[PDB]
Amino acid sequence: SGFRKMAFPSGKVEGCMVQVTCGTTTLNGLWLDDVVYCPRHVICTSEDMLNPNYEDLLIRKSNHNFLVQAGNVQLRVIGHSMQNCVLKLKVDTANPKTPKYKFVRIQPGQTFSVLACYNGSPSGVYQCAMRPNFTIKGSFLNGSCGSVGFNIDYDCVSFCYMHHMELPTGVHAGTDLAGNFYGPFVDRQTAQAAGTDTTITVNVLAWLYAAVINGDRWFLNRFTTTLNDFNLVAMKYNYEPLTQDHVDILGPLSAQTGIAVLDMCASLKELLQNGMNGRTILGSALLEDEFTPFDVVRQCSGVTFQ
Amino acid sequence: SGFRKMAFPSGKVEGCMVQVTCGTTTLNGLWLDDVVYCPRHVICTSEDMLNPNYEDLLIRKSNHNFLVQAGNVQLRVIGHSMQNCVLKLKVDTANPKTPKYKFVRIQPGQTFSVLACYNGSPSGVYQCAMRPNFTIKGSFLNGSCGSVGFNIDYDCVSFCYMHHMELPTGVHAGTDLAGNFYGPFVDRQTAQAAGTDTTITVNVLAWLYAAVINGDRWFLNRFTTTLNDFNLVAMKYNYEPLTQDHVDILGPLSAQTGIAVLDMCASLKELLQNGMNGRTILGSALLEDEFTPFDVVRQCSGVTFQ
Ligand SMILES: *[C@H](O)[C@H](C[C@@H]1CCNC1=O)NC(=O)[C@H](CC1CCCCC1)NC(=O)C1(NC(=O)OCc2ccccc2)CC1
Ligand SMILES: *[C@H](O)[C@H](C[C@@H]1CCNC1=O)NC(=O)[C@H](CC1CCCCC1)NC(=O)C1(NC(=O)OCc2ccccc2)CC1
Numbered sequence: 001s002g003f004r005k006m007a008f009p010s011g012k013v014e015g016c017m018v019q020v021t022c023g024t025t026t027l028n029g030l031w032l033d034d035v036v037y038c039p040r041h042v043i044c045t046s047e048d049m050l051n052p053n054y055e056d057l058l059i060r061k062s063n064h065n066f067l068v069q070a071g072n073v074q075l076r077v078i079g080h081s082m083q084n085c086v087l088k089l090k091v092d093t094a095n096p097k098t099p100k101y102k103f104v105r106i107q108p109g110q111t112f113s114v115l116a117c118y119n120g121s122p123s124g125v126y127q128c129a130m131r132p133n134f135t136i137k138g139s140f141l142n143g144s145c146g147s148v149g150f151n152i153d154y155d156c157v158s159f160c161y162m163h164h165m166e167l168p169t170g171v172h173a174g175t176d177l178a179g180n181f182y183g184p185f186v187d188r189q190t191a192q193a194a195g196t197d198t199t200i201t202v203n204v205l206a207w208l209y210a211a212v213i214n215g216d217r218w219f220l221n222r223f224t225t226t227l228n229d230f231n232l233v234a235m236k237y238n239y240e241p242l243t244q245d246h247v248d249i250l251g252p253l254s255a256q257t258g259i260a261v262l263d264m265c266a267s268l269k270e271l272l273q274n275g276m277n278g279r280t281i282l283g284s285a286l287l288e289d290e291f292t293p294f295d296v297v298r299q300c301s302g303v304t305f306q
Numbered sequence: 307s308g309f310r311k312m313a314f315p316s317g318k319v320e321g322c323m324v325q326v327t328c329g330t331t332t333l334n335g336l337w338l339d340d341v342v343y344c345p346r347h348v349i350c351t352s353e354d355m356l357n358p359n360y361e362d363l364l365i366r367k368s369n370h371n372f373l374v375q376a377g378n379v380q381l382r383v384i385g386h387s388m389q390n391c392v393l394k395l396k397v398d399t400a401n402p403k404t405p406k407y408k409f410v411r412i413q414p415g416q417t418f419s420v421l422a423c424y425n426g427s428p429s430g431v432y433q434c435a436m437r438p439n440f441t442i443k444g445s446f447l448n449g450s451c452g453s454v455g456f457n458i459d460y461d462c463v464s465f466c467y468m469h470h471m472e473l474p475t476g477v478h479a480g481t482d483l484a485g486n487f488y489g490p491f492v493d494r495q496t497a498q499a500a501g502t503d504t505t506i507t508v509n510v511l512a513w514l515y516a517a518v519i520n521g522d523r524w525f526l527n528r529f530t531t532t533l534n535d536f537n538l539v540a541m542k543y544n545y546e547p548l549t550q551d552h553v554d555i556l557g558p559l560s561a562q563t564g565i566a567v568l569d570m571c572a573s574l575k576e577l578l579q580n581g582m583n584g585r586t587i588l589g590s591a592l593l594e595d596e597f598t599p600f601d602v603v604r605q606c607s608g609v610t611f612q
Pocket of ligand 2 (some may be wrong): 001333345350355446447448449450451452469470472473474478492493494497498520573
């Protein structure tokens with residue numbers, strides 16, 4: 001038993017991290033087969049940032065302007081191209097450590113692990129969610145751009161995030177691995193702000209099921225609620241609407257614990273209206289929303305990877 | 307910016323995990339050079355558990371009774387010995403993935419990353435502290451024994467924990483890698499209980515400094531306190547005594563933020579006496595104690611590893 005904010009083992013991704021230097025900017029790249037992926041703002045200078053035209057900026061570059069360091073081995077760049085907001089540097093060496101992998105664009109509410117890196121070297125791993133407002137609440141300093149977020153399915157790494165920038169509220173914005181920003185953000189120094197966020201309802205409910213699986217039951221009650229009457233309460237507390245599809249996804253957890261999904265919703269209702277009254281759930285004094293239903297099942301049943 | 311409960315990159319440890327099967331018991335081993343380390347209760351049967359004599363149990367074993375699987379390659383055992391509560395299985399193949407490593411026995415209050423494993427395959431990584439009562443609040447199911455906890459210093463893995471058992475409160479007990487239990491626990495099915503725990507004061511203070519570094523300051527005040535008068539307050543709230551050595555360790559964080567250690571203690575005093583009044587710190591509604599001063603400095607300055 002026990003329940004922890006668990007990240008995926010990072011080894012398959014660590015073998016892919018490289019350093020990319022162009023001009024006065026250094027950041028991380030992701031090396032898969034003979035391509036290094038990195039944020040295109042690496043080609044920016046301290047006087048391009050206001051309104052760059054990256055197409056113009058890139059046509060002025062030569063391959064030898066890109067300095068790619070994989071540990072203590074320089075990789076020679078033999079071609080480059082831009083895909084949305086990511087740069088793809090073709091190098092003459094295929095990464096022998098390349099895992100089985102996919103690029104995936106995730107939905108808000110989905111979680112992933114972030115391997116934070118500086119100068120191509122990993123610093124740490126932690127678990128994130130894509131917030132409903134398409135930011136992530138990460139931990140990123142200067143130099144961390146190009147760190148990636150990922151999930152693992154048995155032997156396959158699904159890359160879903162690469163880091164680009166920090167917004168004025170101290171939250172983070174980035175792209176999928178094909179260079180498309182999550183949310184309305186752009187890689188340009190202009191007025192940009194996160195916008196109002198909401199709590200991921202289906203995830204809170206999953207975490208309440210995790211609590212029950214692990215022996216916290218003080219928050220349960222005998223009541224039920226309808227989906228409609230629940231969402232009327234969620235609306236008021238800045239919670240995402242719960243859909244029937246959410247209810248179906250919570251089916252396995254409902255069946256394992258014997259607590260119908262709508263009964264768990266009635267418990268969440270009372271927690272929202274009454275607070276916890278100085279009590280904790282799974283070591284938290286807040287309602288936690290960065291565990292998906294799949295995360296709960298993975299951790300409570302012991303799924304492994306290869 | 308941002309502050310997350312960050313684990314070390316797990317790749318160097320993933321390359322060391324193996325499966326150890328003896329009789330009807332399967333668990334994980336740690337493969338370093340030509341030795342596999344695993345909990346000695348692997349030699350127990352479902353009718354030895356009450357009061358085993360492991361010396362007797364082990365002399366009855368043959369090398370071929372130990373089935374060691376490193377992925378889809380069986381490793382042949384050529385010798386075995388017992389060191390305290392760990393079994394050391396000598397195999398005919400040195401692990402080519404063996405990192406630079408140390409075995410270290412940590413003090414209560416120190417943190418580490420746990421690579422949770424089943425059948426020799428990693429499941430996830432998360433950050434723990436050794437509690438003052440020598441338990442850890444982990445996430446462990448049947449089959450997870452032999453998972454290890456570790457820290458990394460630049461290129462060296464310092465192994466500090468290997469998992470053995472779960473106590474009746476749902477917390478976890480285990481050994482250093484030389485087989486010595488943390489705390490009074492024994493690998494025997496008898497009445498054992500964690501005992502009263504306390505909050506790690508020096509770590510709470512470190513985390514308050516992390517909050518200041520990251521822009522939460524609402525909890526600061528103009529007051530100060532003496533060490534004595536602080537510890538009189540900590541005593542009452544089941545907090546560990548703060549020593550002068552703790553104060554010295556918090557020196558760098560004090561100097562970076564400009565907030566004297568004893569001034570931060572006065573802030574912690576008021577938080578203990580008044581609560582947070584519905585406010586959060588670094589996304590928590592509780593005072594967090596599983597970040598050491600070194601953890602805060604590592605994450606806020608961007609230390610990497612190789
Ligand atoms: C890359 O390593 C780095 C990481 C970043 C540093 C601090 N924390 C982080 O996560 N990214 C940047 O430094 C990034 C570079 C620019 C991105 C846009 C294209 C030009 C390069 N800069 C930022 O993170 C910042 N913010 C920003 O661009 O967003 C909008 C904004 C910022 C400030 C006021 C109003 C609006 C912080 C510059
Ligand atoms: C190994 O993989 C496994 C992990 C453990 C299962 C559930 N969560 C976990 O962390 N360890 C065990 O199953 C372990 C085996 C025994 C250890 C002692 C020597 C014989 C083998 N068993 C336990 O974890 C348990 N508890 C225990 O021994 O502690 C004292 C106790 C337990 C129950 C009542 C009173 C006192 C749970 C059996």
